[PDB]
Design a protein around this ligand. Sequence first.
Ligand SMILES: Cc1ccc(NC2CNC2)cc1C(=O)N[C@H](C)c1cccc(-c2ccc(CN[C@@H]3CC[C@H](O)C3)s2)c1
Ligand SMILES: [Zn+2]
Length: 316
Amino acid sequence: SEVRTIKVFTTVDNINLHTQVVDMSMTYGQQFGPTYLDGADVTKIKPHNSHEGKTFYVLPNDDTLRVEAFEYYHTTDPSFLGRYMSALNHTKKWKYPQVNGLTSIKWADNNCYLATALLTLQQIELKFNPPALQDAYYRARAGEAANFCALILAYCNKTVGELGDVRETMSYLFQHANLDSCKRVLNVVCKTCGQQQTTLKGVEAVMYMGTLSYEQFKKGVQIPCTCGKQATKYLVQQESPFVMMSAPPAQYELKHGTFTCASEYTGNYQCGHYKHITSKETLYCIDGALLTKSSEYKGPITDVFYKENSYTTTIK
Ligand SMILES: Cc1ccc(NC2CNC2)cc1C(=O)N[C@H](C)c1cccc(-c2ccc(CN[C@@H]3CC[C@H](O)C3)s2)c1
Ligand SMILES: [Zn+2]
């Protein structure tokens, strides 16, 4: 039969586009291997006329693309790009309303942990290392978050429709962000053992599991010693843009202007519901596209974020 062709562009990063000529007999998979158009999988689909001039994502099958993909995504996981496109295919159908001047996500496919994490990122000082996240985050901040939510799902290895833990998500995100200058100094005192001082850098310096209260962390918290007698661990110095204080969900009271934002978890382990509480002129509770205001909030809190620059203890 007659040989028909169109010109298209193939890419890994949507920065470097490569012109390709395609046969309208064969499928995209036959010609380039797995292929995607705005996340949809067209590997088994033959070219259409409307496809002419459009940009397609493909897998790296030569050194140029591999280098391009690594520089942009800072990963070599060969499933990464297929999971990103697979996820994006769903995240592009989500609605990202501006609630309180921050970008949220209308609830779908248990995205309540992603709404809350996205709302948190817009409230704390953070620079991602992978250009893919820098670029998607900047678009997200301005109300186009479908690529950011797709990359988060891809980086966190989560499927659409699966509920995730906000503390884990953020931890993964922190690992891909520049926190080299973040420092924390802890002191532990035991009447028997003595005083021991430890320094922490990066992600370890901005996160803590076992108390929501930044103030309690500075007074001291009780922890079990190696010896077995109770010991007091307290914060001596902290240099970071913020601190994330986590604990298993507990009835907690949040007071206006004593924190930046908090994750509220209702329900049971890995099958519950997240809400985002932020401190502005009053307390705002953001629940996807839903918003309510109050001067006071008691409820089950699991993460609390506090802004910070430089703290030093006046203890001893
Ligand atoms: C939602 C979710 C998804 C995935 C995972 N995956 C695991 C792999 N990494 C973690 C976790 C969770 C999770 O549920 N997290 C919450 C924070 C959480 C964390 C830890 C403990 C709990 C709970 C324990 C008991 C729970 C029910 N009771 C509430 C607690 C006191 C309130 O009065 C009522 S939740 C949850
Ligand atoms: Zn001890």
